[PDB]
Ligand binder design. Sequence first.
Ligand SMILES: [Mg+2]
Ligand SMILES: [Mg+2]
Ligand SMILES: [Mg+2]
Ligand SMILES: [Mg+2]
Ligand SMILES: [Mg+2]
Ligand SMILES: [Mg+2]
Ligand SMILES: [Mg+2]
Ligand SMILES: [Mg+2]
Ligand SMILES: [Mg+2]
Ligand SMILES: [Mg+2]
Ligand SMILES: [Mg+2]
Ligand SMILES: [Mg+2]
Ligand SMILES: [Mg+2]
Ligand SMILES: [Mg+2]
Ligand SMILES: [Mg+2]
Ligand SMILES: [Mg+2]
Ligand SMILES: [Mg+2]
Ligand SMILES: [Mg+2]
Lengths: 59, 155, 114
Amino acid sequence: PKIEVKNDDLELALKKFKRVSLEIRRLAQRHEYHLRKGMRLREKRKIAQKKRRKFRNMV
Amino acid sequence: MRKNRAPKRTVLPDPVFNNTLVTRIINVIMEDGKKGLAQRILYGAFDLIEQRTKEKPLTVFERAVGNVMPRLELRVRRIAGSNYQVPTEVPQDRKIALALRWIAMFARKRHEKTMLEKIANEIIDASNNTGAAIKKKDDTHKMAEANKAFAHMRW
Amino acid sequence: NVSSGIIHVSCSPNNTIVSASDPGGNVLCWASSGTMGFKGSRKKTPYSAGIAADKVAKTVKEMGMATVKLFVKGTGRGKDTAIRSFANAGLSITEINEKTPIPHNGCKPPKRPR
RNA sequence: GGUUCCAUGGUGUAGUGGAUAACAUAUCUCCCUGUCACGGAGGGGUUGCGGGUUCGAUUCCCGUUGGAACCGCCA
RNA sequence: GGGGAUGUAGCUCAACUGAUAGAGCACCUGAUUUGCACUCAGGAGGUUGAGGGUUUGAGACCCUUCAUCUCCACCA
RNA sequence: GGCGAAGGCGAAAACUUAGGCCAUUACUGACGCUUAGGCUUGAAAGUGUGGGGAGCAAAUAGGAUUAGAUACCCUAGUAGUCCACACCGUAAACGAUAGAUACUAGCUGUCGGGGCGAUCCCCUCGGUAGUGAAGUUAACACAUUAAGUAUCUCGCCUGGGUAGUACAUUCGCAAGAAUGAAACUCAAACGGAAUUGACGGGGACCCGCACAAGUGGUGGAGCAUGUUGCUUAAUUCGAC
RNA sequence: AUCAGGACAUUAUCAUGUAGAGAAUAGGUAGGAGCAAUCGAUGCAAGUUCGCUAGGACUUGUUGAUGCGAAAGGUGGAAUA
Ligand SMILES: [Mg+2]
Ligand SMILES: [Mg+2]
Ligand SMILES: [Mg+2]
Ligand SMILES: [Mg+2]
Ligand SMILES: [Mg+2]
Ligand SMILES: [Mg+2]
Ligand SMILES: [Mg+2]
Ligand SMILES: [Mg+2]
Ligand SMILES: [Mg+2]
Ligand SMILES: [Mg+2]
Ligand SMILES: [Mg+2]
Ligand SMILES: [Mg+2]
Ligand SMILES: [Mg+2]
Ligand SMILES: [Mg+2]
Ligand SMILES: [Mg+2]
Ligand SMILES: [Mg+2]
Ligand SMILES: [Mg+2]
Ligand SMILES: [Mg+2]
């Protein structure tokens, strides 16, 4: 997950790096705990439903 | 849970050296509701300060009290076990208040003679950064410096 | 004695590690929250991560490098305090690449404490 | 019948090479709680019997009780 | 018997081959707990075994004793 | 979101192979639905033999916490989790809703085939969802994928505890599975839905010397007064 | 037989080097009391010595005709060519 600094400013790098790390942290923390396959599908289905319903009202 | 900010009573400019702070410390050394007695004791100490330090009493008092005055305050915040402390910047009004409260408490415990000379020695002893009030200010400051890490989380 | 190099900064949820290394292997210096003097639970606080970065930044700057590739690691809490620590030290941060181990569904993770 | 060990507070156990006896539980008083348990503070309570040595015995010595542990074979 | 060690605070041990009397834990007070502890601050506690000499000076260097620790040989 | 009757199926490829949807000027001409008995499949755990074992972790050991902790936390850790061949045949195996057939407003999505030809969008035929009236229901709710109007067939139910227990029987190497009572006891049941409160170491909001910030006290001492206990011929009675 | 490595001895290598005080890094003794000048002054620049981060000596570069109060002056246990 390389992001170039562009050497024009520093903040901008961290403004993109905050996003990249958050999506990175989701899977990093997911492959930290063992749920049964049924429970694993439940959290996958749970996140999709949250994101969907949230996306409906900003569109 | 109150949503209301308390009012503040006037501090009054001092009646001699015209230095407000004298009235506050007078009220601090007040005991038994004696305005008179407290004034006499305190003013008498300035006559001894003249006799001893050969300098202006108001200047010595500001140099002692302003120097004893602390900067950081550690507020106790318990969650599960013991309390992790939080250093916060004290407002200016409260800043002066702890110094005066502290000056009197260590004055009424010295091995000296009549509290007149007792309090006189404490004020002259704090103008040179070597006393009992200094140690208290040093101790709370060192705890805050030790507890710099937990300053970001307050409540 | 080298101009460019790599600094791996691993941020575990319980501790942190900052390793300054040559562009390929062969670390030149290292520091950690334990070596600072913090012990027990305080080692996992962002302030400690910043403190560790400051000492290692100071040591390696006297050794004399300018361009730094920052291999950020871990999933702790002080993952950005050490990054900002280097920036106030003034080293030239060139890349902000992240290399926290991610699995592709390999190995079963431990059980959940409850 | 014979030989070794033990007897310390209310209960389980340490010490003492003569001058001195503690630990835990238990007990009592007070915080603690609607109340009680748990928790906190403080308080208290001791050498099996006898008989000698010593200025002085729980300790050292010889006997007498009680409780144990060992043995009591060859024909 | 021969060699090698040690003695510094209440309890262990650093020193430093000569110029500091120290570190840690026990004891005490302060911050802090539901407690119990952990943590944080301060403080004391020494003929540096004795004796003699070195050096301008010593606990140290050397000599000799006292005590304990180790060892390392043993046909009355 | 897709597929399969269910369990289930998600890196890529090859071989073998199952079912399904749409249009049929083709063909057979009732050959169809259900199914006691029977057969096949059937999550995970478990069994037997032989391999495999990185990670994790029942049993087990230790450190914590605790009044106690054989548990929740942490460090280790065997069987097991994996493969091949043999068994076991149970699950909240759930859409808690057997299969088949015909009919009954509508609206919004999404997927596949077909018709048009940039998609997008429109129509037709089906699968999978949401909302929704008549209708049904004790209510929650179902509502063209019915729990609605009706038909066929199979399986199952007859108060609660005893009890899925005991005996007999069948299967299984084993644990066990299937089948399955009674004596005795109760007036109801860890019955169903819904309502008003209370409560929550459930949330959201708002108040008071509540906490916080200060001041002066109490608990330690002497004394005054009241109470508990004890005593006494009585220590009159009540307030706890 | 050969190679490489460090053990410990060295042939042979001389700065090192840090009581106060003293102007001073005082390693101990310079025999002593002025001495060095192509047997080359003096100058400042670079590196190194080790550190008691003040200072030390040494080398290199400038490099040329008087330096050396580390002779005589200094204090000190230790001392000035
Ligand atoms: Mg875990
Ligand atoms: Mg009370
Ligand atoms: Mg016989
Ligand atoms: Mg299985
Ligand atoms: Mg155990
Ligand atoms: Mg483990
Ligand atoms: Mg097993
Ligand atoms: Mg069943
Ligand atoms: Mg509905
Ligand atoms: Mg019945
Ligand atoms: Mg049955
Ligand atoms: Mg029942
Ligand atoms: Mg209700
Ligand atoms: Mg308060
Ligand atoms: Mg009282
Ligand atoms: Mg009392
Ligand atoms: Mg009464
Ligand atoms: Mg009554």
